[PDB]
DNA sequence: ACCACGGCGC
DNA sequence: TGGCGCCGTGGT
């Protein structure tokens, strides 16, 4: 309110900034302002004014820092009340929402954003008083990570445009083949991408039985859940499912990628966000790396499109079975911990325990059953879905779930304990104290309660895995920077680096030891590491 | 263009 | 298998 001072601000001001568009690598900086002690300093020319700052403190600090890096200015992000809000409650994911909740308003003026940032930070910092685990997470994980993420987003990754052109044509050709077959079975062309038109074809013209309904529009569903069951009702059903698979891959991960190549860098600049998810896992966008298929050979073909700069090599590091390792640590189950201390193939070992047989006598189908259960228990898979993933009777599925918990009773115990903590405290927590609120545990509708139950015992595992990775990223980055290597991508429990040929194997060695020793667990952390000219070739 | 929606990937 | 980023569709 009282007088706006002229640029530049005193050291330690919070920034507010307006971009021409939300993606900083592609945006123009339209306006910059700083606030300290409630007084605002507005920048005459924003790009030059960036030079006057030593740190970006404020809402979306990381995003200003990426744009600053684009311009060759080293402007590290620092304090950011988004990070505080997210630690207090991970349903806090955006500035608008955080302002709506805690005070103030997210507007479109730089000066006001800078003033809001300063007030919110003080406010939220006060609300965190005495929350020592969350404060530890802020100082040791979230704040320093934000600078790592700025480096990753600003550096981007090289794409193999020639390879993607060839992949596009190969997929395009298979799609054309399938739609021709579909039209022949239907007797006319129609828009396969229109669920309304497909509904008419399947259930009115071809007279197939409808099963499920749609959620809100109240029509006959054509979802995979329905088509799955109808695969014998008509040969057209299988063709649609194949068509959908390929068209989703092409529309999402083949066609858009070259347009994301930045004209100034010649690289693709994946956006990373540390306040997006319920669990604390990093999120990515443009493209969303998390949803590149993980089973299909198609998924593998997409990773082949990510390549090293000439003379460099990609290094891919993955925390193997980290979710189950974390579950072993949280549960304290001695039989599960043993598997991982023995360094044995953990699904074979699981099968060995479950079925009461030596490991030599575990056959591949038994291993598959154990693998399915290991992750079904983790994610709270149903006996019904189990019996159809293994293709066995429903009652044999139930028996198999119980068999797992008889062998790993402390896992059963930990799940129930976690739900009890959640029902009593209103939230659950990770190893490090990252917190998720779970109000719908005490709910009437069975459907909703069970979804809440699943979040309640997943979040502690997923979030612990998440913060192990983040902590490792924070620790690795200054070591990589000094070698002239880069951190490029993070997805699931995997990290991808770029280093010159000559330093590649040294960088691999270094990254593996930092990641494996980032924190002591009841079981060791194991990192799978590979080196290659593309991402697919590096993951092995 | 905006939006909600079905559908699908994790 | 298991909140949201993603796509194309269809209503303004």
Report the 3 state secondary structure along A264-278: CCCCECCEEECCCCC
Would you list the DSSP string of A4-42? PEESSPPTTPEEEEEESSS-GGG--EEEEEEEETTEEEE
Residues A303 and A379 reside in one and the same domain:
no
**Contact between residue A301 and residue A515 where contact means Cβ atoms under 8 Å apart:** no
Residues A126 and A245 reside in one and the same domain:
no
Closest nucleotide relative to residue A448's CA, C1' based: C3
Could you give the CA distance from residue A292 to residue A299 in angstroms, rounded to a whole number?
6
Residue where a domain stops, chosen among A432, A465, A498: A465
Q: Which residue range forms the structural domain that includes residue A331?
A: 322-465
Report the helix count and the strand count for chain A, using DSSP H and E.
22, 14
Closest nucleotide relative to residue A91's CA, C1' based: C3
**DSSP code of A520?**
-
Token output for A221: 């569903």
Residue where a domain stops, chosen among A154, A174, A196: A154
Element (H, E) at A248: helix A235-249
Distance of A8 CA from C5 C1′ (whole Å)? 39
Distance of A379 CA from C1 C1′ (whole Å)? 8
Could you give the CA distance from residue A36 to residue A148 in angstroms, rounded to a whole number?
26
Distance of A199 CA from B5 C1′ (whole Å)? 15
Token output for A28: 């123009």
Could you give the CA distance from residue A457 to residue A429 in angstroms, rounded to a whole number?
9
Distance of A14 CA from C3 C1′ (whole Å)? 32
With a CB cutoff of 8 Å and minimum separation 6, the contacts of A527 are: A317, A318, A319, A320, A511, A512, A515, A516
Q: How do beta strands A435-437 and A271-273 pair?
A: unpaired
Long-range own/partner contacts, residues A181-185 (CB < 8 A, 24 or more apart): A181/A239, A182/A236, A182/A239, A182/A240, A182/A243, A185/A234, A185/A235, A185/A236, A185/A239
**Contact between residue A15 and residue A53 where contact means Cβ atoms under 8 Å apart:** yes
Token output for A222: 């054509």
Residues A94 and A126 reside in one and the same domain:
yes
Token output for A197: 């038109």
**Contact between residue A77 and residue A146 where contact means Cβ atoms under 8 Å apart:** yes
Could you give the CA distance from residue A46 to residue A50 in angstroms, rounded to a whole number?
7
- Could you tell me which residues are beta bridge partners of residue A206? none
Which residues have CB atoms below 7 Å from chain B, the nucleic strand?
A 195, 199, 214-217, 219, 221-225, 227, 241, 244-245, 248, 290-296, 299, 492
CATH at A436: 1.10.150.20
Residue pointed to by tokens 């007797």 = A187
Report how far apart, in Å, the C-alpha atoms of A39 and of each of A13, A19, A32, A42, A316 are. Answer: 10, 22, 14, 10, 47
Token output for A65: 């820092």
Residues A263 and A374 reside in one and the same domain:
no
Could you give the CA distance from residue A178 to residue A243 in angstroms, rounded to a whole number?
6
The 10 Å Cβ neighbour count of residue A147 is 21
Distance of A382 CA from C2 C1′ (whole Å)? 10
Could you give the CA distance from residue A352 to residue A359 in angstroms, rounded to a whole number?
5
Would you list the DSSP string of A362-429? --HHHHHHHHHHHHHHHHT--HHHHHHHTT--HHHHHHHHHHHHHH-HHHHHHHHHHHHHHHHHSEEE
Closest nucleotide relative to residue A251's CA, C1' based: C7
Could you give the CA distance from residue A323 to residue A152 in angstroms, rounded to a whole number?
25
Distance of A293 CA from C1 C1′ (whole Å)? 14
Residues A449 and A481 reside in one and the same domain:
no
Distance of A251 CA from C7 C1′ (whole Å)? 7
Distance of A214 CA from B6 C1′ (whole Å)? 7
**Contact between residue A521 and residue A326 where contact means Cβ atoms under 8 Å apart:** yes
**Contact between residue A115 and residue A17 where contact means Cβ atoms under 8 Å apart:** no
Distance of A138 CA from C11 C1′ (whole Å)? 45
Residues A329 and A314 reside in one and the same domain:
no
Number of domains present in the structure of chain A: 4
Distance of A254 CA from C7 C1′ (whole Å)? 13
Resolution (angstroms) equals 1.9
Element (H, E) at A110: helix A110-127
Distance of A168 CA from C8 C1′ (whole Å)? 19
Residues A262 and A279 reside in one and the same domain:
no
Residues A194 and A265 reside in one and the same domain:
yes
Closest nucleotide relative to residue A277's CA, C1' based: C3
Closest nucleotide relative to residue A276's CA, C1' based: C4
**DSSP code of A280?**
S
Nucleotides of chain B in contact with protein CB (under 7 A) are 4-10
Token output for A527: 């990192």
Q: Which residue is nearest to nucleotide C8 (CA to C1')?
A: A193
CATH at A490: 3.30.70.370
Closest nucleotide relative to residue A195's CA, C1' based: B6
Residues A460 and A481 reside in one and the same domain:
no
Closest nucleotide relative to residue A381's CA, C1' based: C1
Could you give the CA distance from residue A111 to residue A94 in angstroms, rounded to a whole number?
19
Nearest to A213 by CA among A203, A230, A198, A226: A226
CATH at A178: 1.20.1060.10
Which residues have CB atoms below 7 Å from chain C, the nucleic strand?
A 91, 93, 191, 193-194, 196-197, 248, 251-252, 255-256, 276-278, 283, 285-288, 291, 371-372, 375-376, 379-382, 385, 389, 451-452, 454-455
Q: How do beta strands A39-42 and A5-6 pair?
A: parallel
Residue where a domain stops, chosen among A421, A447, A465: A465
CATH at A46: 3.30.420.10
Residues A276 and A399 reside in one and the same domain:
no
**Contact between residue A320 and residue A334 where contact means Cβ atoms under 8 Å apart:** no
Nearest to A59 by CA among A110, A101, A20, A8: A110
Could you give the CA distance from residue A389 to residue A238 in angstroms, rounded to a whole number?
18
First to last CA, chain A: 60
Could you give the CA distance from residue A313 to residue A306 in angstroms, rounded to a whole number?
11
Residues A174 and A29 reside in one and the same domain:
no
Closest nucleotide relative to residue A216's CA, C1' based: B5
Nucleotides of chain C in contact with protein CB (under 7 A) are 1-10
**Contact between residue A367 and residue A347 where contact means Cβ atoms under 8 Å apart:** yes
**How does A243-264 read in b/e, with b if 16+ C-beta sit within 10 Å?**
bbbbbebbebbbeebeebbeee
**Contact between residue A469 and residue A319 where contact means Cβ atoms under 8 Å apart:** yes
**Contact between residue A12 and residue A57 where contact means Cβ atoms under 8 Å apart:** yes
Residues A2 and A147 reside in one and the same domain:
yes
Residue pointed to by tokens 């999402």 = A252
């Amino acid at each position: 309110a009282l007088e706006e001072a002229p640029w530049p601000p005193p050291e330690g001001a919070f920034v507010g900034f307006v971009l021409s568009r939300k993606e900083p690598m592609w945006a123009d900086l339209l306006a910059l302002a700083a606030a300290r002690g409630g007084r605002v300093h507005r920048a005459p020319e924003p790009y030059k004014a960036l030079r006057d700052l030593k740190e970006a403190r404020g809402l979306l600090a990381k995003d200003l820092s990426v744009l600053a890096l684009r311009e060759g200015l080293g402007l590290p992000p620092g304090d950011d009340p988004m990070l505080l809000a997210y630690l207090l409650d991970p349903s806090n994911t955006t500035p608008e929402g955080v302002a709506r909740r805690y005070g103030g308003e997210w507007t479109e003026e730089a000066g006001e954003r800078a003033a809001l940032s300063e007030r919110l930070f003080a406010n939220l910092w006060g609300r965190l008083e005495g929350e020592e685990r969350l404060l530890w997470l802020y100082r040791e994980v979230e704040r320093p990570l934000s600078a790592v993420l700025a480096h990753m987003e600003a550096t981007g990754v090289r794409l193999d445009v020639a390879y993607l052109r060839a992949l596009s044509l190969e997929v395009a050709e298979e799609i054309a083949r399938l739609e021709a077959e579909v039209f022949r079975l239907a007797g006319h062309p129609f828009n396969l991408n229109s669920r309304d038109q497909l509904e008419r074809v399947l259930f009115d013209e071809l007279g197939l039985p409808a099963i499920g309904k749609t959620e809100k529009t109240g029509k006959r569903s054509t979802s995979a859940a329905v088509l799955e069951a109808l695969r014998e009702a008509h040969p057209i059903v299988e063709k649609i499912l194949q068509y959908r698979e390929l068209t989703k891959l092409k529309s999402t991960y083949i066609d858009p990628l070259p347009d994301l190549i930045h004209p100034r860098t010649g690289r693709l600049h994946t956006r990373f966000n540390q306040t997006a998810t319920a669990t604390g896992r990093l999120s990515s966008s443009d493209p969303n790396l998390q949803n590149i298929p993980v089973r299909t050979p198609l998924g593998q073909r997409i990773r082949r499109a990510f390549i090293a700069e000439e003379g460099w090599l990609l290094v891919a590091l993955d925390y193997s079975q980290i979710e189950l390792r974390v579950l072993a640590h949280l549960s304290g189950d001695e039989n599960l911990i043993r598997v991982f201390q023995e360094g044995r193939d953990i699904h074979t070992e699981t099968a060995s325990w479950m079925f009461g047989v030596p490991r030599e006598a575990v056959d591949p189908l038994m291993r598959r059953a154990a693998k399915t259960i290991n992750f079904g228990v983790l994610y709270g898979m149903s006996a019904h879905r189990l019996s159809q993933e293994l293709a066995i009777p429903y009652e044999e599925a139930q028996a198999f779930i119980e068999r797992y918990f008889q062998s790993f009773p402390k896992v059963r115990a930990w799940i129930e304990k976690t739900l009890e903590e959640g029902r009593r405290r209103g939230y659950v927590e990770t190893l490090f104290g990252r917190r998720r609120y779970v109000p719908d545990l005490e709910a009437r509708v069975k459907s909703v309660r069970e979804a809440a139950e699943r979040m309640a015992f997943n979040m502690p595992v997923q979030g612990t895995a998440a913060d192990l990775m983040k902590l490792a990223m924070v620790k690795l980055f200054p070591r990589l920077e000094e070698m002239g290597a880069r951190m490029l991508l993070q997805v699931h429990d995997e990290l991808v680096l770029e280093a010159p040929k000559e330093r590649a194997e040294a960088v691999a060695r270094l990254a593996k030891e930092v990641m494996e020793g980032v924190y002591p667990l009841a079981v060791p952390l194991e990192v799978e590491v590979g080196i290659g000219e593309d991402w697919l070739s590096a993951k092995e």
